[PDB]
């Protein structure tokens, strides 16, 4: 059984993507649900689990079957507990792009998430670990990270810091190896 992964804080998307691309044997993505209709080249159970009834998915959301659920363009989307479990049971760490609220939900489902928060040391440090954004965007990312830590600190398996994304990525990989015992 492989513990699912939730990385949070600035650069988490880049970390998620890189783990998936670098170690395809170790990490995988689970299959999400949506109520939107299936399109060409899409396969039920691979791209999405396609739900025929919006009423069904709402009931399931209310029954706590989803660790993360939302809507876009008139349709429902979500990441089910069972989909994560299916990845974990195949021996792969499920890389989850989800909010910190999904951590307590995975714990309550006894899936043992490894929740890693990437903490910016300062506004200055955000522009060190993310080279794609402006100072005022970094300010907004910094305020978000501050609020996330204030709220979710108890949920974190570990907090990582660094002066570059490369260093942070290195620490992230090390945390996952250590917590995979």
């Amino acid at each position: 059984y492989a513990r699912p992964i939730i990385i949070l804080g600035p650069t988490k998307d880049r970390a998620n993507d890189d783990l998936l691309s670098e170690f395809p044997d170790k990490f995988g993505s689970c299959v999400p649900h949506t109520t939107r209709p299936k399109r060409e080249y899409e396969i039920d159970g691979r791209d999405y689990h396609f739900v025929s009834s919006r009423e069904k998915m709402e009931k399931d959301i209310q029954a706590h079957k989803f660790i993360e659920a939302g809507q876009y363009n008139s349709h429902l989307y979500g990441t089910s507990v069972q989909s994560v479990r299916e990845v974990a049971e195949q021996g792969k760490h499920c890389i989850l792009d989800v909010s910190a609220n999904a951590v307590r939900r995975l714990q309550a489902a006894h899936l043992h998430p490894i929740a890693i928060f990437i903490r910016p040391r300062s506004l200055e440090n955000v522009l060190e670990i993310n080279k794609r954004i402006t100072e005022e965007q970094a300010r907004k990312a910094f305020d978000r990270a501050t609020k996330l830590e204030q709220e979710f600190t108890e949920c974190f398996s570990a907090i990582v810091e660094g002066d570059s994304f490369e260093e942070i990525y290195h620490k992230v990989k090390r945390v996952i190896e250590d917590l995979s015992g």
Binding site: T34, G70, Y72, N73, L76, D97, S99, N101
Partner: peptide, 15 residues
Amino acid sequence: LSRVKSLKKSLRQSF
């Protein structure tokens, strides 16, 4: 962040 996947966009309106 242009042409963000729809699943990732759905995170912006969460329940």
